[PDB]
Amino acid sequence: AQYEDGKQYTTLEKPVAGAPQVLEFFSFFCPHCYQFEEVLHISDNVKKKLPEGVKMTKYHVNFMGGDLGKDLTQAWAVAMALGVEDKVTVPLFEGVQKTQTIRSASDIRDVFINAGIKGEEYDAAWNSFVVKSLVAQQEKAAADVQLRGVPAMFVNGKYQLNPQGMDTSNMDVFVQQYADTVKYLSEK
Structure with missing residues (x-):
């Protein structure tokens, strides 16, 4: 074809219900x-081309950066609950990978504070059960697909x-190609 299994996508030999x-x-x-995220804006360009009535979900994972990695997964859960993904995604990336000023859960918190989330409000979420189930989801979804x-x-x-x-x-071509593949698979 033009889109071949094993080429631009792979198929899961054990499909995932309810995903x-x-x-x-x-x-x-x-x-x-x-x-x-920073250079290509994949998730954004995929959105731009998906049909809609299509929902887009993004989750964080634990298996990188040990202790901090989990903290980040909890923090991303907080981002989802407060609807602030748009405001922390970049400073989190740059804090971890560029400037390297994120070394503790407290530093993660600083990003949210500087992004305008209120201390009271962050800590509240951080410890909320709603966040706990949102950590669960992220772990479950990754677990449901053998993600490594x-x-x-x-x-x-x-x-x-x-x-x-x-x-x-x-x-730009990589992104378009990526995006269109997502559209195609969407329509399958």
Whole structure:
């Protein structure tokens, strides 16, 4: 064809029932994720081309950066609860990978505070049970797909984006190609 299994995507030999339609996994420790977010804006360009009535889900993972990694997964859960993903994603990435000023849960908190979230409000969420189930989801969803690497995108629990089998000479072209593949899989 033009879109072949094993080429721009792979198929899960054990499909996942009830999965979010589009599901993306990242880590703030993950350099390609930094690239995916900061330079390419993958998640944004995928949105731009998805049909809609399509919901997009992004989760963080634990298996990178040990103790801090989990803290980051809890923090991302807080981001989701307060609806502030848009305001912390960049400063988290740059705190972890660029400036390297994030070394403790407290430093993570500083990003939120500087992003305008209120101390009381952050700590509240941080410890809230709603956040606890949101950590659970992120771990469950990753668990439901054998996830061992990031970035990673899944479409309806049956197809996994395979960016390695796509052209990278031109950034914009890689993104378009990525995005369109997501559309195609969406329509499958």
